[PDB]
Amino acid sequence: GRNAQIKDTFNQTLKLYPTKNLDDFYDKEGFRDQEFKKGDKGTWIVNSEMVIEPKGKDMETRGMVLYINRNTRTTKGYYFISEMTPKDDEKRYPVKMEHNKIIPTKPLPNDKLKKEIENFKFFVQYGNFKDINDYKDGDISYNPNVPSYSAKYQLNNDDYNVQQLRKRYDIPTKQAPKLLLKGDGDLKGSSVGSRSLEFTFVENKEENIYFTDSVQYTPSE
Ligand SMILES: [Ca+2]
C-alpha cells in the first residue's frame, strides 16, 4: 500500500547517513528525472538547522546551507541566523567548502560566530539511522493533493542521533524527541519533490525546539 511506498522512499533518504566527507557528493548522482538537462551533473543541497524557541522568548534559528555543484566541483553557501518565529530577519554569512572544511568568505561581526562556522558539521556528516522499519510506533500520513507524506516515530534519549545532537548543541529540554520524516511530490521521486527529517523535541503553541536536516539532489540553477 501507500504506507510501504512511503517507508521505502524515506529509507532511501536515511541511507545517506552518514556521508562524513562532503566532497564525496561531487561524485554522487541522485535520482534523475526529465527536469535535468543532459549536461547538468546536478547539485546536492545540504541544510542543517537548529531551532530553539523557549516559552516566553524569541524563536532563534541557526544553520547552514551548502550548494555542492557537481558541474563546477565547487561548494558555496551560507550560515544563517534568525530570531523570527521567507524569514523577515534572516542574516546570512557567506561561506565556501574546500577539502571538507568550511571557510567564511567575508569577515564576521564576532568570534563566536566565526568559530561556529569553522567548526560546523552538517547532520549528514555524523547521523546514522536504523532501517526505517526498525522504528517503533509510527504514524504514517499520506495526502494525495500534492502529494505529501510523513512518518513519525518516538525516539529514546539513548538513541545514537539524539546523543550526537545533544553533544553538539545546547538543547534546553530533557525530552526525548520524535523523528519526523517528510516528503512531497510523486512517491517514486521528483527532482522538484522534497525530502527532509526533523528531531522534534518540543512542539506546542508557545515553545518549539527542533532540528531539521535535508540532503537533496537537484538540478543546478
Ligand atoms: Ca526530490
Side-chain angles (χ1 to χ4, degrees), residues 31 184 189-195 216-217:
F31 171 81
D184 59 50
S190 169
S191 70
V192 181
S194 291
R195 292 292 178 271
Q216 300 184 94
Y217 175 67

Side-chain angles (χ1 to χ4, degrees), residues 2-204:
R2 294 291 180 197
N3 286 358
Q5 299 161 36
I6 294 162
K7 288 172 177 155
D8 195 5
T9 188
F10 286 155
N11 224 18
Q12 292 313 107
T13 283
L14 301 178
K15 92 184 174 301
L16 298 165
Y17 296 83
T19 302
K20 298 178 192 162
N21 188 344
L22 297 174
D23 287 0
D24 284 10
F25 285 115
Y26 294 137
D27 300 305
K28 289 195 186 284
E29 185 184 284
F31 171 81
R32 280 190 72 96
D33 56 11
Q34 275 41 57
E35 313 300 299
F36 285 81
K37 304 191 190 63
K38 190 179 184 308
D40 184 20
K41 293 192 179 176
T43 290
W44 283 96
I45 307 182
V46 301
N47 183 342
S48 292
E49 53 199 72
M50 183 72 219
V51 178
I52 303 167
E53 183 211 351
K55 184 159 52 161
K57 315 180 200 150
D58 315 329
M59 173 174 285
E60 190 174 73
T61 301
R62 303 196 166 241
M64 199 181 288
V65 182
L66 288 176
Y67 297 74
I68 299 168
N69 187 312
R70 299 187 59 215
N71 300 306
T72 64
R73 297 183 67 90
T74 58
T75 295
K76 293 185 204 170
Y78 55 88
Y79 190 73
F80 64 95
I81 300 176
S82 167
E83 284 152 39
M84 179 204 79
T85 317
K87 279 269 197 275
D88 64 14
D89 75 342
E90 186 168 308
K91 309 296 180 296
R92 302 181 176 175
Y93 297 96
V95 304
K96 65 184 192 172
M97 191 276 296
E98 303 175 350
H99 303 289
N100 206 34
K101 271 39 185 186
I102 310 298
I103 304 170
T105 59
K106 279 179 173 94
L108 285 305
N110 62 64
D111 192 65
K112 167 184 198 197
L113 247 188
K114 199 180 188 180
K115 290 313 188 281
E116 285 181 2
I117 295 165
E118 291 178 13
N119 298 321
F120 194 83
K121 290 292 186 171
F122 280 85
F123 181 69
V124 74
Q125 299 178 271
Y126 59 85
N128 193 334
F129 291 97
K130 288 189 282 186
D131 177 273
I132 198 169
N133 306 286
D134 292 352
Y135 293 97
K136 270 64 180 166
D137 292 308
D139 280 336
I140 312 305
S141 160
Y142 172 70
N143 187 344
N145 175 65
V146 171
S148 58
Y149 29 96
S150 61
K152 189 197 283 186
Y153 303 101
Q154 175 67 54
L155 301 180
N156 299 313
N157 272 327
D158 72 352
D159 175 272
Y160 174 76
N161 300 306
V162 176
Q163 295 188 315
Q164 288 290 317
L165 292 167
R166 286 187 206 281
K167 184 184 189 149
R168 288 164 193 274
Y169 292 97
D170 290 318
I171 305 192
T173 168
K174 290 178 187 179
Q175 299 302 117
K178 302 292 188 182
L179 178 57
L180 175 61
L181 313 172
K182 284 155 68 169
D184 59 50
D186 191 289
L187 275 161
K188 306 186 62 168
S190 169
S191 70
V192 181
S194 291
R195 292 292 178 271
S196 63
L197 62 82
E198 173 183 323
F199 289 88
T200 316
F201 298 86
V202 176
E203 176 187 79
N204 57 49

